[PDB]
Amino acid sequence: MKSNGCRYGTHRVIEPKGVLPQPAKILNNDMSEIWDNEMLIDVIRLNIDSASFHQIKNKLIAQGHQDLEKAFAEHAIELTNRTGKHKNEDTGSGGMFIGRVAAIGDKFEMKEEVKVGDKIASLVSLSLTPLKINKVKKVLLDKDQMEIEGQAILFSSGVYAKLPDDLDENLALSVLDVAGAPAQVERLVKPDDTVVIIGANGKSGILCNAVAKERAGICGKVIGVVRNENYIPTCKATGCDEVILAQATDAITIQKEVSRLTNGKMADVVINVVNTEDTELPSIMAAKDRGMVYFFSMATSFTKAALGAGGIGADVDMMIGNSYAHHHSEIALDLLRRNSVLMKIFKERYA
Amino acid sequence: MKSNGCRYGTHRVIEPKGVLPQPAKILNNDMSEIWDNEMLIDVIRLNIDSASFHQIKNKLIAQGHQDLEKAFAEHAIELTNRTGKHKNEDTGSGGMFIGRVAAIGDKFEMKEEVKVGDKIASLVSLSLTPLKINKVKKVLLDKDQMEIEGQAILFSSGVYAKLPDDLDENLALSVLDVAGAPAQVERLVKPDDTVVIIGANGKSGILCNAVAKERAGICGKVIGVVRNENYIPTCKATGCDEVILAQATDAITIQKEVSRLTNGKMADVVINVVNTEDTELPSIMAAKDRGMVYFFSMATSFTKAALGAGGIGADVDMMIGNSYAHHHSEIALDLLRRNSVLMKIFKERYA
Ligand SMILES: NC(=O)c1ccc[n+]([C@@H]2O[C@H](COP(=O)([O-])OP(=O)(O)OC[C@H]3O[C@@H](n4cnc5c(N)ncnc54)[C@H](OP(=O)(O)O)[C@@H]3O)[C@@H](O)[C@H]2O)c1
Ligand SMILES: NC(=O)c1ccc[n+]([C@@H]2O[C@H](COP(=O)([O-])OP(=O)(O)OC[C@H]3O[C@@H](n4cnc5c(N)ncnc54)[C@H](OP(=O)(O)O)[C@@H]3O)[C@@H](O)[C@H]2O)c1
């Protein structure tokens, strides 16, 4: 065991020098001796990024490979052994792994309590994960996955979730996928708040509906916004008191309907969890003066939010929805355990 | 004086229907009768967006116009008379105007107290401003301006600043450009906070240095970050207690230097005011646990911040720097009046 290791992982950066593992081109994936603050994993499955996976598979077909499953297998071994990680050299994507804990450093910053043998999922990108592929058992082209045998490093700054046996299935990775959303909502929503959730039928949306209603309480008002009227029962069943029918890009409609349902006082907290562009200005206009607008979605444009609010003189706070929060996986899993309505919907939708 | 007018200005939207003035293609620029909540301006100068201005001038030179000032003038009049506003039809950029107040609706939501005849600048984009150009006196090709005779509408939701009588105007207009930054810093920085300002020598940086230090107080710590060693005296003279020499993209150096200067405690508030990309992760890594990272610059990428913080498990708050805040023009101008050092530095650089 080697001592004084960087939680950000610079001790495993080979090329170039003085950059973090993610921007690094070549990482040190030598799993024979670990650092004091690292944690080693016996990798079971690689969930590759769907655009990265699709991109590599096509490039192998354009070079005239016949056996795509082996060619992808061939591509993975060469990529990881040369660069130390499965960072797509063209798109710069990656993914996550599922494995079992293999060794734990003495000075490892423990987040979720795990021991050797625990089955954990990774919530950080493969583009920063030291990875060594010893064998490729299967290459599922339709599942963007690889059944392998290898090992990976989690730095002390890394993020992982302990996968439960009592919760079965891939219920958890669909939850870990959006676990940062409900954890953040419970920090934002006060008792008696009026909450507007735009994209209230989505994966993270319905989790936000439930947590928002729990926090705002009996005298709070949770208002969903959805594009399609077939979604109204689900929004109300997952916590919305009222539901608006509008395109998330329809700023004027959403404003008048929120104003009507709140007698012109508007929302204290607006949660945006749609996957569409040009919904920044509608989200801003649903909020009251000095209200909170929380952007969770990757379709959010920084510039449209920052300048949009200026043009209409909207003094509201606009926060970038962090993908991580302390205990966000435990909290999101707890939410499904406490909320039977959500649990069923998740098992039906993302089993 | 027509009644029941929308503060967002939808009552002047001709094409298409049910969109805000900004995305609208054609606005109603009929200045013969105003609405009850609007304010009419006799425009003196049009400061067009420099990318929009440059693009139009080039488009006119590639179409083979000889008299460029005369060609630009006709392009402005035709665009405004056809569409009602000076929104660039290709890039979608506008700008700002300077004028004197001509008429004030009785139901106009007055922010800064102004009367008829007061010389005001507008802080909302020309891309949403109903504008009618009756004459183009001058077309300053090197200064991105047009000395015109026309009129513009300000909606109740618009933002404007009264040009001060006690001050200059080359100076005052330069401050409104960044007035949202010092106003926001005053809300974020608590007494005894450690404040890190990335881009500490810039226009907004020096305003942020001063506001951070007065708010953080004698037992607070204000740390500037600059690439160039010639900037340390200005950074320290405008409020920084310490200055780090590093590239804003150098996460590891900035992290080690903030840690060294704070005995591993890091910053309570990180203010990012560089207009360089790939500074999200350095800003995040300078913050302490649960600290605040405020992104003011338009070079900020939403996804790089949102995913960047996740990969290193940084549970920090990331705020989108709103371009507007209540009384932000008065607050930034007051800052220059109390601080002679800022005033002197501003007069030299921006006049
Ligand atoms: N950093 C993180 O933690 C993280 C992780 C994953 C995803 N995200 C981002 O956060 C968002 C949450 O996505 P998700 O996982 O909840 O997937 P999702 O279920 O697809 O969420 C999006 C929902 O919004 C609705 N919607 C989309 N466009 C709309 C529009 N124009 N008008 C009205 N409704 C609209 C969709 O319903 P209909 O299309 O049926 O109307 C959809 O159900 C994603 O956009 C993603 O970019 C963030
Ligand atoms: N109303 C609006 O349009 C609006 C509203 C909100 C925010 N903003 C944005 O706020 C941002 C702040 O810019 P500003 O005009 O206030 O300041 P600025 O005058 O553009 O200065 C930026 C400063 O950052 C310094 N810096 C230090 N290290 C750097 C590095 N590695 N890369 C780049 N710069 C570095 C620069 O010094 P060097 O000379 O060494 O580079 C420069 O002094 C702008 O992006 C602006 O677009 C605009």
Q: Is A4 exposed, middle or buried (0-12, 13-18, 19+ CB in 10 A)?
A: exposed
For A100-120, b/e burial (b = at least 16 CB within 10 A) is ebbebbeebeebeebeeebbb
Ligand 1 site, residue A276, Cβ cutoff 6 A: yes
Query: A317: which chain B residues are within 8 Å (Cβ-Cβ)?
Result: 319, 322
For B271-297, b/e burial (b = at least 16 CB within 10 A) is bbbbbeeebbbbbbbbbbeebbbbbbb
A-B CB pairs within 8 A amount to 143
Give the one of B158, B306, B321 whose C-beta lies nearest to A306's C-beta: B321
A39: nearest Cα among A110, A98, A94? A110
User: How far does the CA of residue A284 sit from the closest CA of chain B (Å)?
Assistant: 11
Q: From the centroid of its chain, how far is CA B191?
A: 27
Bridge partners (DSSP) of residue A40 are A103, A153
DSSP assignments along A121-167, one per residue: EE-S-GGGS-EEEEEEEEEETTTTEEEEEEEEEE-TT--EEEPPSTT
Query: A321: which chain B residues are within 8 Å (Cβ-Cβ)?
Result: 306
The contacts found for A109-116 with CB under 8 angstroms, 24 or more apart, are A109/A7, A109/A37, A109/A156, A109/A157, A111/A159, A111/A160, A111/A326, A111/B313, A112/A160, A112/A161, A112/A162, A112/A327, A112/A329, A112/A330, A113/A162, A114/A160, A114/A162
What is the distance between the alpha carbons of residues B300 and B281, in angstroms, rounded to a whole number? 10
Give the one of A20, A124, A252 whose C-beta lies nearest to B251's C-beta: A20
Q: Answer whether A309 sits within 8 Å of B319, measured CB to CB.
A: no
What is the distance between the alpha carbons of residues A59 and A73, in angstroms, rounded to a whole number? 14
What is the distance between the alpha carbons of residues B216 and B65, in angstroms, rounded to a whole number? 57
- One-letter identity of residue A320: I
Q: 3-state DSSP call for residue A9?
A: coil
B19 at interface of A, judged by CB pairs closer than 8 A? yes
Q: Answer whether A320 sits within 8 Å of B295, measured CB to CB.
A: yes
What is the distance between the alpha carbons of residues B160 and A265, in angstroms, rounded to a whole number? 24
Ligand 2 site, residue B248, Cβ cutoff 6 A: yes
DSSP B85: S
Q: Which of residues 85-124 of A touch B (CB under 8 A)?
A: 111, 123-124
Phi, psi of B113 (to 5 degrees): -70, 115
Ligand 1 site, residue A247, Cβ cutoff 6 A: yes
Distances from the Cα of A67 to the Cα of A45, A64, A70, A146, angstroms: 21, 10, 6, 15
Query: A111: which chain B residues are within 8 Å (Cβ-Cβ)?
Result: 313
Shortest CA distance from A187: residue in chain B: B317
Q: Which of residues 164-193 of A touch B (CB under 8 A)?
A: 180
Query: A318: which chain B residues are within 8 Å (Cβ-Cβ)?
Result: 319-320, 322
Answer yes or no: are the C-beta atoms of A247 and A227 closer than 8 Å: yes
- For ligand 2, atom 22, name the residue with the nearest CA: B202
What is the distance between the alpha carbons of residues B81 and A330, in angstroms, rounded to a whole number? 60
Give the one of B255, B313, B317 whose C-beta lies nearest to A324's C-beta: B313
Ligand 2 site, residue B197, Cβ cutoff 6 A: no
Ligand 2 site, residue B325, Cβ cutoff 6 A: no
Q: Cα(first)–Cα(last) distance of chain A, in Å?
A: 40
Q: Answer whether B312 sits within 8 Å of A253, measured CB to CB.
A: no
What is the distance between the alpha carbons of residues A346 and A324, in angstroms, rounded to a whole number? 21
The two beta strands, A221-226 and A194-198, are parallel
Ligand 2 site, residue B300, Cβ cutoff 6 A: no
What H or E segment, with its residue span, contains residue A42?
Answer: strand A39-48
Q: Is A55 exposed, middle or buried (0-12, 13-18, 19+ CB in 10 A)?
A: middle
What is the distance between the alpha carbons of residues A99 and A148, in angstroms, rounded to a whole number? 10
Residue at token pair 């949403």: B128
The contacts found for A229-236 with CB under 8 angstroms, 24 or more apart, are A231/A200, A231/A201, A234/A201, A234/A206, A234/A345, A235/A200, A235/A201, A235/A206, A235/A209
Elucidation method:
X-ray
- Catalogue all structural domains in chain B, each as residue range(s) with its CATH number: 10-163 (no CATH), 180-349 (3.40.50.720)
Answer yes or no: are the C-beta atoms of A41 and A26 closer than 8 Å: no
Shortest CA distance from A304: residue in chain B: B298
Q: Answer whether B322 sits within 8 Å of A313, measured CB to CB.
A: no
Q: Answer whether A10 sits within 8 Å of B124, measured CB to CB.
A: no
Q: Residue ranges of the alpha helices (H) in chain B? A: 50-62, 68-83, 170-176, 180-188, 203-216, 232-237, 251-262, 280-286, 302-311, 328-338, 340-349
Q: Which of residues 240-259 of A touch B (CB under 8 A)?
A: 250-253, 255
Answer yes or no: are the C-beta atoms of A266 and A259 closer than 8 Å: yes
Shortest CA distance from B126: residue in chain A: A311
Distance of CA A275 from the midpoint of ligand 1 (Å): 4
For A206-221, b/e burial (b = at least 16 CB within 10 A) is bbbbbbbbbbbeeebb
Q: Which of residues 26-65 of B touch A (CB under 8 A)?
A: none
Query: B314: which chain A residues are within 8 Å (Cβ-Cβ)?
Result: 157, 322, 324
Give the one of B20, B251, B326 whose C-beta lies nearest to A281's C-beta: B20
Query: Strands (DSSP E) along A181-238, which ranges?
Result: 194-198, 221-226
Neighbours of B148 (CB within 10 A): 25
Residue at token pair 């150009």: B133
What is the distance between the alpha carbons of residues B325 and B320, in angstroms, rounded to a whole number? 13
The two beta strands, B26-27 and B13-15, are antiparallel
- One-letter identity of residue B280: E
- One-letter identity of residue A157: S
What is the distance between the alpha carbons of residues B7 and B17, in angstroms, rounded to a whole number? 17
B264 at interface of A, judged by CB pairs closer than 8 A? no
Supply A68's token pair: 């795509």
The Cβ-side half-sphere exposure at A36, using a 13 Å CA radius, reads 7
Bridge partners (DSSP) of residue B271 are B197, B294
Total residue count of chain A as it appears in this document: 351
Ligand 2 site, residue B256, Cβ cutoff 6 A: no
Bridge partners (DSSP) of residue A276 are none
User: How far does the CA of residue B135 sit from the closest CA of chain A (Å)?
Assistant: 26
What is the distance between the alpha carbons of residues B68 and B136, in angstroms, rounded to a whole number? 13
A186: nearest Cα among A160, A217, A162? A217
Neighbours of B47 (CB within 10 A): 20
Answer yes or no: are the C-beta atoms of B299 and B277 closer than 8 Å: yes
Supply B256's token pair: 């080690």
Query: A325: which chain B residues are within 8 Å (Cβ-Cβ)?
Result: 315
Strand order in the sheet with A317-320: A242-245, A221-226, A194-198, A267-272, A287-295, A317-320, B317-320, B287-295, B267-272, B194-198, B221-226, B242-245
Query: A305: which chain B residues are within 8 Å (Cβ-Cβ)?
Result: 320
